[PDB]
Design a protein around this ligand. Structure first.
Ligand SMILES: CCNCCOc1ccc(OCc2ccccc2)cc1
Length: 330
C-alpha cells in the first residue's frame, strides 16, 4: 500500500504545516502537525477542557463506530518549546492520503497548554519519530508509520515541505519526479528515539564549505534550524546589523536586509537553504527588526534540522531494519 497527502503552511511564515487526517467511522477529518521529532498521535477532542478549545476541529470518539477506549491508558507529553498536552487513549481507524491503519492509538486530549489553544489551525500532532518515545502508559503505543510499515510497498515515508507553498507527505514510495539529481543517504542513530544524523558541515552564502560533524535531528515539527553557537554566529556575522537579542530570544536582523543562503552537508552532497527561507518577519507587528530562521541550539542540548532546513530538500525517512535518512535537492 501507499499514501500521499498534501501538507499546507498554517500561515504566511511557514510557522508549521498541517496535513488532513481521517479518524473514525464515519471519517472525522482533523488537520494534524506531522512531527518527525515526537511519537504521539494526539488530537483536540470532545474530552478537551472547554476553555482550552478555541476554533480547532475536535475528534468525538462517541460518534465513531470503530472507536474503542484503550482501558486504563493515559498520556502526557512536554515538548522542547515548553508546550504540553495530556489525556486518555482510544484505538480507531486512521487514514492519511489513502493509507489506512486499523487499531491506531488516538490520544484524546483532556488538557492542552496555551500555545495549542491559541493556534486555531492545528487540531493535534501526528508523531513520526521512533515508537520508543511514545508517552502512553502503562502500555506504550506505536506510531502511525510503525503500524503501517509492514503493509507499505517500501518501509519509508518522505517529507517534501514547501516554501510559502503546500508540499507533500508520501508513505510507502519515493516519488522520483519530486527531486533533482540523486538522493544521498546518511546513517541514523535511534538511541534517543529521533531521526538523528550527522551533517558533514556548512557554508554561509558563497563562502567556503567548512568540514565539521554536526549531530542533529530531522524534525518536521520544529520551525527553525537550531545549530551550534559557532555556526550561527558565523552566519549572522554576514548580515549587517544582525545581533543576538536576549529580550527577543534569539538573533534578529534588519528587515531591510537581503539574507545570504546557508548550505549544509549530507555526506559529500550539499543542500542549499536560500536566504529568503531564513526570514521569519517582524518580531512584532510593524517592527523593522526581523526574526532569524537560524538560531543557536546551545540552550536545547541537541541540534535541530527543523522546517527551515528540511523545506530546502526532498527528505526520505527510511524505516528499513537499519533506518537511514536521504536528502535530495529539488
Ligand atoms: C518541540 C517542537 N516540536 C513539537 C511541538 O510542536 C509544536 C507544534 C505547534 C505548537 O503550537 C504553537 C506554535 C505553532 C507554530 C510555531 C510555534 C508555535 C507548539 C509546539
Amino acid at each position: 500500500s501507499t499514501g500521499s497527502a498534501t501538507t499546507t503552511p498554517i500561515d504566511s511564515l511557514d510557522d508549521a504545516y498541517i496535513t488532513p487526517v481521517q479518524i473514525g467511522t464515519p471519517a472525522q477529518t482533523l488537520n494534524l502537525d506531522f512531527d518527525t521529532g515526537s511519537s504521539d498521535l494526539w488530537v483536540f477532542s470532545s474530552e478537551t477542557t472547554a476553555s482550552e478549545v478555541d476554533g480547532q476541529t475536535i475528534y468525538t470518539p462517541s460518534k465513531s463506530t470503530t472507536a474503542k477506549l484503550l482501558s486504563g491508558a493515559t498520556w502526557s507529553i512536554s515538548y522542547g518549546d515548553g508546550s504540553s498536552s495530556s489525556g486518555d487513549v482510544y484505538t480507531d481507524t486512521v487514514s492519511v492520503g489513502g493509507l489506512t491503519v486499523t487499531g491506531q492509538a488516538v490520544e484524546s486530549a483532556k488538557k492542552v497548554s496555551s500555545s495549542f489553544t491559541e493556534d486555531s489551525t492545528i487540531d493535534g500532532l501526528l508523531g513520526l519519530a521512533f515508537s520508543t518515545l511514545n508517552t502512553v502508559s502503562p502500555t506504550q503505543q506505536k506510531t502511525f508509520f510503525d503500524n503501517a510499515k509492514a503493509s507499505l510497498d517500501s518501509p519509508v515515508f518522505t517529507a517534501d515541505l514547501g516554501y510559502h507553498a503546500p508540499g507533500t507527505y508520501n508513505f510507502g514510495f519515493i516519488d522520483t519526479t519530486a527531486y533533482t539529481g540523486s538522493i544521498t543517504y546518511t546513517a541514523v542513530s535511534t538511541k534517543q528515539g529521533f531521526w538523528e544524523w550527522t551533517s558533514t558541515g556548512y557554508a554561509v552564502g558563497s563562502g567556503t564549505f567548512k568540514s565539521t560533524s554536526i549531530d542533529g535531528i530531522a524534525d518536521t515539527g520544529t520551525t527553525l534550524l537550531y545549530l551550534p553557537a559557532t555556526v550561527v554566529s558565523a552566519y549572522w556575522a554576514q548580515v549587517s546589523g544582525a545581533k543576538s537579542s536576549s529580550s527577543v530570544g534569539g538573533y534578529v536582523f534588519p528587515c531591510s536586509a537581503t539574507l545570504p543562503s546557508f548550505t549544509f552537508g549530507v555526506g559529500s552532497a550539499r543542500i542549499v537553504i536560500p536566504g529568503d527561507y531564513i526570514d521569519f518577519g517582524p518580531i512584532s507587528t510593524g517592527s523593522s527588526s526581523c526574526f532569524g530562521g537560524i538560531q543557536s541550539s546551545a540552550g536545547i542540548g541537541i541540534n535541530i534540522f527543523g522546517d527551515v532546513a528540511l523545506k530546502a530538500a526532498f527528505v526520505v525517512f527510511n524505516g528499513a531494519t537499519t533506518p537511514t535518512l536521504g536528502f535530495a535537492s529539488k
